[PDB]
């Protein structure tokens, strides 16, 4: 046993798939539109798996035969596990909207996206390299079907294409490396892999063979979550792909793929080289994403940089060694995500306005004055104002990179947040201050994208009166690796 | 060496299948076929020969030699080349590949690069669409020619072909999986185009779908070549599904049992059956015909598997 | 069973090979490491002679990939 | 080879290491047996909610009911595996110092 | 084939024989050499198994010679294998030793 | 003699990667150079399966032949629709 | 002398990444492929070799070549004679282990090859079938039918 | 104390050497006791096996002991280790010496953990030195079901000696307080004398020293005999304001246990004087020599009796006397197990006129010297005092007393392994050096680590019945059931020596 | 792979054979007597997908007495994700 | 630890002692006797730079006999 979690979804993915391809290949049916029948039956498919994982958490361990030669599930897993259904969940709950505007037949297109999940869960407890690829190249094949969904038109197309580009050499360069790695070790597992590179020291002990594949296999990684030194078309893939799709790779397979992160390196490998790049990705994807909010104008891309920019404050946790740091960057992934989706659905909640700039987006002060409040405080949480949760999240990561003694990091992703505030008390400005542009009025959306911004809004203010139990959350994950 | 001993005899046995196909498919119409050229037509083939050779080009284009004038030169070295691993009685194959089956799979999906690029060199839109249509009807009952060799493979231990060939001693796999060897040649007649299978061979449409540029060698290599790989395919239904070189096993005082005999005797059902299956029916279409490989010999050749598998499985009779 | 005998057949005559290549190869061994410690004269050399081990277990010394294929 | 030892294990009385099929599944609790109807109801409840718009209610009920069996009979058999095995709160040990 | 010299051919053909007997020898030195697979540490070992076999020949070379002359021409003509000529076989078993 | 089977190995993969370098105007060329570097990797695994005398490589080169096969199958499937019409 | 002729794989590789015609690309590719399926036999990994002519040599670079006709881009060894009274066949070797030990690894290629199966089919179906040959679809009621053009 | 690193950042890399089985919580351990106390499962702490006699069963359940030897606690101005039973003693002697106070007596093997070998009859060489059993003041003992109580030598005399002579059957020992005496040193002395020679010179070096100890080989007239003496303090030149090369003479750092590994550097350096007692080996010739003695028994081989004459000679050649502190310097057992079975005469102050300290050595050395079948390995004899209620605070009086410990040691490994240790047992059972055909009227007491009236297949009515007539271990019977009902802590040896 | 160079050799000996079959036309006989099929690429991409999985077939083929009823049943689950894929192909109507 | 033939592999036998080691093992440093004994097996690096040495040396000598 063991594997039910998972089996359940795959399981669910082929269940919907055949209920998909059958009914819409129906006459007597009139061919209809499966996509938002497979969604809601699709968001409970994942909402049955998170039930599944969480209830059988002290017996995922099952047996010997699947952790050692498959995939090892531990109490960090879970929590994470859970929490990446939860992400999907929450972003399928505000692509419902887009389904039912767009005219989606696409019932396939549910059906990849649980796909990409049962990846996503397995690139979680996946404990071998083979594993890990296999996994991981699962739930970015799933994705690049998603952001090519738009075939009559070919922004979406062309944006798929060098996604996929970037997808399959971010999995084939991870793919060289556990070659090398394997030629070393003799053995494809984690676990066996920790135990010959425990301490391998590139500096102190020898270690040819293994630091030529832990190079390739570190660089596929950076691709996967759009690290700046990598980053290369992955910004545009955000922006030329509608919003909501946009949103599903922006949360998931970064989660999913830092998740996989810490799992690979810090437990497989022990050498001075892991931390050093993360720590150099840190300041230079913050300082990107800092130039980057300034010089990006459309509200779209801004949000991918400004996600790229978090990234950056999230990287820092890992470059710090300290458990403590690992928790930060913990802390800081649940942020992100909530304010993510938080983003996204706010920008969806401006379905009616077409590609549009910021300061078309502006005189949202005299219409909808609540909204207005609402997309000042998305801004706010990743600028770092001290009341939001992100800034929580990001002291907890300064308080630990200081502890860490990262003062030099620590100073730039501040500078970086400083960077930051100026734009989007300019953005605050722009929304009520100045630059109305035509007291553009806007539209209505679905209870749940609403619900989305309800419970992430009030949960980023009520941060500061409870924040305790996220702290508590994060650092056990990090113990259990 | 000792391959002109197994690609000579195989050129006279294609040279002399065109006669017997002519021959035979003409008795099956009330009718002699080739009978005044040689004794009973015997010397026929070398008259078709001889005329190919001493006709005149159309046009020399002897500039263009690289390009399809040795992609028919491709097409006919691999329905050659599968031929060395097909043992015609113990010991007699010339290579005993421990994976002979997969290499046989492996020639088979270069073949399809044969047709694919024989009919690209010719620069003709009807002709070339015409070779990638044959290329996917080959290639779409390669599947299902997999799945029945997975089939003939779960009763054997190995892909060794003397082997699945001494696998049955006790009884040809031809008698159990009857329903298979239906479908073997019902794909080996797919597979190469000479059948009820042959819309882009309608009589017509072969001549002009295949090349430009004939000079009669490529006209004769390519029925060269359909006629070698006829052989070969059918020198596969019979050592999978009949027993490759195995008698009855009677122990007759009348027969001393030669081997090659027997495994020519068979060889030569499965010929005169690709004859007579190509005289009594009609032909398929190739709408209905990829049709029938995807939805007809995938699913039964599947199935074949899961039973071959199961029925030996619970039983251990692996 | 026919495989069974063969392989039984070959498991039996297998100790007989087996001492034949055992005398064989240790003959080439004491010829190499007689050929060692005169390449190496044993003073500038490997101070110890043959000191293949590397811990406590043999191995046949070495080869390249796959010779048998 | 396989075995069912377990990391974290027996944290609780086993009652039966290794449970047979068709015995944990006769062990359901009334609390399984009402976990495994409310899964498919929900499953069914959204499987026909969801097929209103495009006219498939009944089928899609069908589909949604398939996935429903299939997850709560996953759970209700996590459950009482957890419990006949030494995983969860494992109440129902007067079954065997009773049979 | 000639004198017992050990040929692949009349140790396959024999290894009935060497299997009924010249058994202690064969696991001894098999005992050896899953203890440990060094060639020296029982090289004595390797002897004694030699020893025994090549006796066993020299047995079965002295009596019914033309029969295993036959078998052996067997076991070089189709390389070691059985089936080809159980007649053989059987002529060789059946004569002197079963 | 598993440097030579290697290295060459080796730098076939930095063709593969070269080509991708240079090629990012024409993608035909990328998806060749990317079943390229996927060759050299499972090359790769087979050679340092046969010298390590172990079963692992083979296993996983297995594999990713039949990953990188579904991944060409997709990438010109994606090509071929990239080229809309 | 062979086994130094991979230099045919090595040259070949770099005309790939050097070639504007495509059909030299695709040909080499090709060669590429049928060089390193000659390594793999000399290495003895003969399933390998097989594999790599069938799943490359007359799958992916058939469909290469279909992107490149249409769609024109413009002494002393000491044998250990145990272990040899029976030899596993390369096949034999990876089923002992592919399908029972590591099974998984080989049932998550399976879900690979299920996910290419339906990527073909979304992505290359092409408005063909029922994707849009559903119908044109009307609906008269709320047609305006000559009211408003 | 710390663990040897953590490369993960994290208890994931785990060390521990010995008990590498992993021991759980003791919060957690006990909880397992209690589980065990309500599944009446047999658990027994983890056993080296290095004492013949089954303290630790791999049938019963195993705890780790790692823990208990990690932490460690010695309080000076009490002179007692408060320590929980796992640490082994070798580390427990070590911490002591670095606490400035030295433990009386030793165990005879540094790997076998100090709670263990209070269980198994501890004892020290040493007429006037008493033994390790009385030595520890204080011990804790784990209540069947959850938790411990904590106990005193003066709380509980009888139940202290009740627990100690139960091999740990009757109870489990979670923490051990050992009274640590004043730091004195001792001068190791390693040489060969001739039996007959050395038994009349018995009573001169029991005078001499206090602590005798006899090493008997088979087939060699000259036996190996080591002797410790310990130095008065300040003798020889007075202490003065350097520490180290003032107080040299008096006391100087000495190797302990130092051949850890059985291989040892060939080369030669320093004295350079080759020998196979307190160093492995000095001279790479001597190191083969070494491996000729290993293979071949003393009886077959000539060399090892001209080996014992010339080590006593190189010892001669090289420093005449080793001084080191009295942890530094003990006699270790060697890391190698060989069963050793045999039965202990006690030289008991009433018996002591009517059997001479002379005459007790003679006897048993010429039993040793007539016994039918010779067992290649040295046998120890050594010499232990009473539990004297002045040396720890006890209600219970005991009247003082000496023993002589007896232990012969046969090799376990062997070609045809086993078959040797049937003839040995029986040889031990029936033979001159019998526990019961002929010691049974002598009541000598084995050795709790020795296995009893071997083979126990053999006679198993000796170790129920007859042990309770040669010594009153009666009431630890009643007691072994009375301290556990379940019997949780219960090893197979331990329940025929005490139903 | 001893057996390998046989064919290794065929291939040469068969080229050369074809060129003599080439050059003997070539020397008697002298001065005197659709915008683009893409279910060519489905049937193509399908084609690769089963002869991959016929490729998975072949090892638990050839080893399935050593596999006993759990190799078995493990393929049997990748036959039916096989066979999921394959419905959802003939519903979809890919197979035309 | 199976190999291309199977037969346990290799250096499955130095993985056996390098993890049998690596049990409790007090830290990799210690049991780095039994990983570099398993890498040696694996890649034969050991005997490449003796080898290495016995051929410059046998060549050193040639090569000085050669050059005179
Ligand atoms: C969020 C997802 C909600 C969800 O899927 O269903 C809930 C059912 O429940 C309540 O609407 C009933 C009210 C639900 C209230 C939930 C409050 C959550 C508070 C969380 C704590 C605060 C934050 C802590 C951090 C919402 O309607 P629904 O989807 O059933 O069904 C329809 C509904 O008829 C209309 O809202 C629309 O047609 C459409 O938007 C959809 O909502």
């Not at chain 1, 949960?459 to 056990?476: A, C, D, G």
């Not at chain 5, 009924?20 to 004595?44: Q, S």
Request: charged share 20%.
């Amino acid at each position: 046993l063991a594997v039910f979690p998972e089996i359940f979804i795959i399981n669910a993915t082929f269940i919907l798939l055949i209920h998909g391809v059958v009914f819409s290949t129906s006459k007597k049916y009139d061919y209809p539109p499966l996509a938002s029948n497979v969604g809601w039956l699709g968001l409970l498919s994942v909402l049955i798996t998170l039930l599944l994982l969480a209830a059988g958490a002290p017996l995922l361990t099952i047996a010997h035969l699947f952790w050692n030669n498959l995939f090892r599930r531990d109490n960090f897993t879970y929590f994470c596990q859970i929490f990446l259904l939860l992400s999907t969940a929450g972003t399928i709950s505000m692509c419902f909207d887009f389904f039912d505007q767009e005219r989606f037949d696409a019932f396939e297109f549910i059906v990849l996206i649980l796909l990409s999940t049962c990846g996503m869960l397995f690139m979680i407890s996946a404990y071998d390299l083979i594993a890990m690829y296999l996994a991981i190249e699962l739930q970015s094949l799933c994705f690049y079907v998603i952001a090519a969904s738009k075939r009559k038109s070919e922004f979406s197309t062309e944006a798929g294409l060098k996604y996929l580009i970037l997808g399959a050499f971010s999995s084939g360069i991870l793919l060289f490396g556990c070659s090398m790695i394997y030629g070393s070790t003799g053995a494809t597992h984690f676990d066996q892999l920790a135990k010959i590179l425990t301490g391998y020291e590139i500096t102190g002990a020898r270690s040819s063979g293994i630091f030529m594949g832990i190079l390739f296999i570190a660089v596929g990684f950076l691709f996967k979550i759009t690290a700046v030194p990598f980053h290369m078309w992955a910004p545009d893939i955000y922006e030329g792909s509608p919003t909501p799709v946009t949103a599903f790779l922006s949360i998931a397979p970064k989660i999913s793929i830092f998740a996989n992160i810490l799992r690979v390196f810090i437990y497989g490998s022990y050498g001075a080289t892991l931390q050093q790049i993360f720590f150099f990705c840190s300041i230079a994807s913050m300082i990107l994403g800092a130039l980057a909010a300034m010089a990006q104008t459309k509200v779209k891309r801004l949000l991918a940089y400004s996600s790229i920019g978090h990234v950056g404050y999230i990287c820092i946790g890992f470059s710090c060694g300290t458990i403590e740091g690992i928790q930060s960057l913990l802390i800081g992934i649940f942020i992100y995500a909530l304010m993510t989706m938080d983003a996204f659905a706010i920008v969806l909640a401006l379905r009616q306005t077409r590609v549009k700039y910021i300061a078309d987006l502006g005189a949202l002060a005299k219409t909808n004055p609540i909204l207005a409040i609402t997309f000042s405080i998305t801004m706010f949480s990743y600028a770092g104002i001290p009341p939001l949760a992100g800034f929580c999240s990001k002291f907890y990561l300064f308080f630990a990179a200081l502890g860490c003694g990262a003062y030099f990091l620590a100073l730039v992703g501040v500078v970086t947040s400083v960077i930051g505030c100026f734009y989007y008390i300019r953005l605050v400005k722009r929304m009520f201050f100045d630059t109305p542009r035509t007291w553009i009025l806007y539209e209505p959306m679905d209870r749940n994208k609403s619900l989305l911004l309800a419970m992430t809004s009030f949960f980023i203010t009520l941060f500061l009166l409870y924040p305790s139990p996220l702290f508590s959350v994060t650092h056990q994950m990090a113990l259990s690796l | 060496a000792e391959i002109l001993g197994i690609i000579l005899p195989l050129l006279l046995g294609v040279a002399f299948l065109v006669l017997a196909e002519r021959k035979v498919m003409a008795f099956v119409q009330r009718r002699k076929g080739p009978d005044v050229v040689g004794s009973f037509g015997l010397l026929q083939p070398l008259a078709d020969g001889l005329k190919l050779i001493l006709k005149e080009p159309i046009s020399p284009s002897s500039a263009n030699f690289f390009l399809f004038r040795m992609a028919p030169v491709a097409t006919f070295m691999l329905s050659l080349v599968a031929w060395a691993v097909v043992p015609f009685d113990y010991g007699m194959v010339l290579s005993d590949l421990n994976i002979g089956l997969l290499y046989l799979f492996a020639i088979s999906s270069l073949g399809v690069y044969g047709i694919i690029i024989a009919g690209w060199s010719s620069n003709s839109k009807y002709a070339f669409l015409g070779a990638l249509r044959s290329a996917a009807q080959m290639v779409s009952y390669e599947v299902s020619i997999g799945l029945i060799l997975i089939t003939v493979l779960i009763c054997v231990g190995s892909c060794n072909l003397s082997e699945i060939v001494m696998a049955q001693k006790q009884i040809w796999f031809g008698i159990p999986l009857f329903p298979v060897l239906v479908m073997f040649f019902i794909s080996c007649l797919a597979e190469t185009n000479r059948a009820p299978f042959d819309l882009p061979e309608a009589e017509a449409e072969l001549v002009a779908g295949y090349n430009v540029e004939y000079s009669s060698m490529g006209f004769a290599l390519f029925f060269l070549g359909e006629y070698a790989n006829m052989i070969l395919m059918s020198g596969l239904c019979t050592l999978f599904f009949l027993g490759g070189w195995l008698p009855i096993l009677d122990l007759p005082i009348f027969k001393k049992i030669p081997g090659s005999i027997w495994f020519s005797i068979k060889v030569l059902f499965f010929l005169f059956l690709y004859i007579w299956v190509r005289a009594a029916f009609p032909r398929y279409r190739y709408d209905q015909l990829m049709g029938l490989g995807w939805k007809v010999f995938l699913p039964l050749s599947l199935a074949w598997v899961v039973s071959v598998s199961g029925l030996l499985v619970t039983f251990q009779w692996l | 069973a026919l495989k069974e005998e063969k392989y039984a057949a070959r498991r039996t005559i297998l100790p007989i090979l087996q001492a034949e290549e055992d005398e064989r190869f240790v003959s080439e061994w004491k010829k190499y490491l007689e050929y060692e410690a005169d390449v190496m004269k044993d003073v500038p050399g490997w101070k110890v002679g043959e000191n293949v081990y590397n811990s406590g277990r043999w191995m046949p010394p070495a080869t390249g990939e796959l010779r048998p294929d | 080879n396989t075995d069912i030892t377990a990391l974290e294990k027996a944290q609780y009385p086993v009652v039966d290491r290794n449970p047979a099929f068709t015995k944990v599944v006769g062990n359901f609790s009334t609390l399984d047996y009402l976990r495994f109807s409310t899964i498919t109801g929900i499953s069914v409840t959204v499987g026909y909610l969801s097929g209103i718009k495009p006219g498939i209610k009944g089928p899609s009920m069908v589909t949604g009911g398939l996935i429903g069996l299939m997850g709560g009979f996953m759970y209700a058999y996590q459950n009482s595996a957890g419990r006949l095995m030494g995983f969860f709160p494992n109440d129902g040990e007067v079954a065997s110092y009773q049979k | 084939t000639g004198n017992p010299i050990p040929t692949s051919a009349v140790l396959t053909a024999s290894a009935k024989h060497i299997g009924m007997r010249c058994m202690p020898e064969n696991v001894a030195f098999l005992k050896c050499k899953k203890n440990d697979p060094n060639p020296e540490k029982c090289l004595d070992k390797g002897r004694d198994v030699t020893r025994c076999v090549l006796g066993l020949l020299k047995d079965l070379h002295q009596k019914c010679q033309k029969e295993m002359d036959d078998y052996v021409g067997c076991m070089y003509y189709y390389t070691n294998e059985f089936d080809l000529c159980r007649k053989e076989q059987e002529a060789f078993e059946k004569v002197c030793p079963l | 003699d598993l440097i030579k089977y290697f290295t060459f190995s080796m730098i076939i993969f930095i063709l593969g990667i070269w080509g991708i370098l240079l090629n990012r105007r024409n993608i035909l060329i990328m998806l060749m150079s990317i079943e390229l570097m996927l060759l050299a990797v499972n090359s790769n695994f087979l050679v340092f399966s046969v010298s390590l005398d172990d079963m692992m490589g083979q296993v996983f080169a297995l594999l990713v032949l039949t990953v990188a096969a579904a991944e060409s199958a997709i990438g010109l499937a994606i090509f071929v629709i990239t080229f809309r019409v | 002398i062979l086994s130094v002729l991979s230099s045919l794989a090595l040259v070949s590789g770099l005309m790939v990444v050097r070639a504007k015609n495509p059909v030299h690309s695709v040909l080499f590719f090709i060669l590429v492929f049928c060089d390193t399926s000659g390594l793999l036999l000399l290495l003895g990994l003969d399933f390998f070799a097989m594999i790599f002519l069938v799943v490359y040599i007359g799958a992916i670079a058939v469909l290469f070549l279909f992107v490149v006709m249409m769609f024109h881009i413009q002494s002393l060894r000491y044998t250990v004679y145990a272990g040899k009274v029976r030899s596993w066949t390369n096949l034999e070797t990876l089923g002992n282990l592919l399908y029972t030990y590591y099974f998984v690894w080989f049932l998550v290629p399976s879900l690979i090859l299920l996910v290419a199966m339906i990527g073909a089919i979304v992505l290359t179906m092409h408005r063909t079938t029922k994707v849009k040959r559903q119908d044109v679809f009307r609906r008269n009621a709320i047609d305006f039918r000559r009211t408003i053009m | 104390e710390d663990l040897h690193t953590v490369s993960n950042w994290s208890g994931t890399h785990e060390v521990q050497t010995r008990n590498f089985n992993q021991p759980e919580n003791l919060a957690d351990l006990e909880a397992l006791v209690k589980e065990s106390h309500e599944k009446k499962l047999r658990i027994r702490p983890v056993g080296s096996g290095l004492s013949p006699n089954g303290i630790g069963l791999s049938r019963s359940g195993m705890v780790n002991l790692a823990l208990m030897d990690k932490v460690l606690e010695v309080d000076k101005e009490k002179k007692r280790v408060t320590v929980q039973a796992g640490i082994r003693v070798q580390q427990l002697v070590d911490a002591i010496k670095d606490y400035g106070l030295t433990l009386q007596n030793f165990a005879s093997i540094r790997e076998q953990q100090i709670g263990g070998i209070i269980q198994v009859g501890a004892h020290g060489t040493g007429a006037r030195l008493p033994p390790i059993d009385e030595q520890v003041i204080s011990m804790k003992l784990v209540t069947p079901a959850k938790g411990t109580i904590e106990l005193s030598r003066e709380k509980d005399p009888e139940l202290f000696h009740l627990a100690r002579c139960g091999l740990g059957g009757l109870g489990v020992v979670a923490e051990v307080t050992l009274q640590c005496v004043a730091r004195h040193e001792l001068v190791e002395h390693t040489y060969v004398s001739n039996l007959q020679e050395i038994k009349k010179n018995h009573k001169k070096l029991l005078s001499a020293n206090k602590h005798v100890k006899y090493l008997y080989i088979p087939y060699t007239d000259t036996v190996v005999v080591v002797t410790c003496n310990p130095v008065s303090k300040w003798s020889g030149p007075p202490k003065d304001k350097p520490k180290y090369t003032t107080d040299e003479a008096v006391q100087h750092v000495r190797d302990l246990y130092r051949e850890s590994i059985v291989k040892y550097r060939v080369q030669d350096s320093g004295k350079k004087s080759p020998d196979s007692s307190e160093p492995d080996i000095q001279e790479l010739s001597f190191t083969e020599l070494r491996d000729k003695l290993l293979a071949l028994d003393p009886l077959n081989d000539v060399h090892v009796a001209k080996v014992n004459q010339a080590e006593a000679e190189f010892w001669k050649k090289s420093e005449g006397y080793r001084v080191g502190w009295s942890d530094e310097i003990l006699g270790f057992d060697c890391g190698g197990q060989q069963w050793v079975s045999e039965s202990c005469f006690p030289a008991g102050t009433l018996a002591n006129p009517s059997m001479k300290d002379l005459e007790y050595i003679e006897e048993l050395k010429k039993l040793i010297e007539k016994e039918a079948i010779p067992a290649p390995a040295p046998i120890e004899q050594r010499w232990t005092a009473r539990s004297k209620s002045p040396i720890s605070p006890a209600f219970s009086t005991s009247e003082d007393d000496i023993f002589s410990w007896v232990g012969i040691i046969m090799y376990l490994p062997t070609a045809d392994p086993r078959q040797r240790k049937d003839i040995t047992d029986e040889f031990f059972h029936y033979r001159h050096l019998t526990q019961k055909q002929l010691w049974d009227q002598f009541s000598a007491y084995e050795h709790w680590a020795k296995i009893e009236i071997p083979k126990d297949k053999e006679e198993l009515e000796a170790l129920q019945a007859r042990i309770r007539k040669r010594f009153p271990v009666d009431a630890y019977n009643k007691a072994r059931r009375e301290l556990d009902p379940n019997r949780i802590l219960s090893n197979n040896m331990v329940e025929k020596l005490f139903p | 792979m001893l057996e390998f160079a046989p064919i290794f050799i065929y291939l040469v000996i068969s080229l050369l054979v074809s060129l003599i079959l080439l050059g003997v036309p070539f020397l008697f006989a002298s001065n005197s007597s659709s915008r683009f099929d893409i279910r060519f690429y489905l049937v193509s991409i399908l084609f690769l997908i089963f002869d991959l999985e016929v490729t998975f077939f072949f090892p638990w083929a050839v080893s399935l007495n050593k596999i006993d009823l759990f190799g078995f049943w493990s393929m049997m689950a990748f036959l039916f994700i096989l066979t999921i894929g394959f419905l959802y192909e003939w519903k979809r109507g890919a197979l035309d | 630890g199976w190999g291309i033939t199977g037969n346990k592999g290799r250096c499955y036998d130095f993985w056996m002692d390098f993890s049998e080691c690596m049990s409790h093992c007090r830290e990799p440093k210690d049991c780095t006797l039994l990983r570099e004994d398993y890498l040696e097996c694996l890649h034969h690096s050991k005997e490449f730079q003796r080898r290495n040495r016995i051929y410059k040396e046998e060549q050193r000598k040639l090569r000085a006999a050669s050059r005179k």
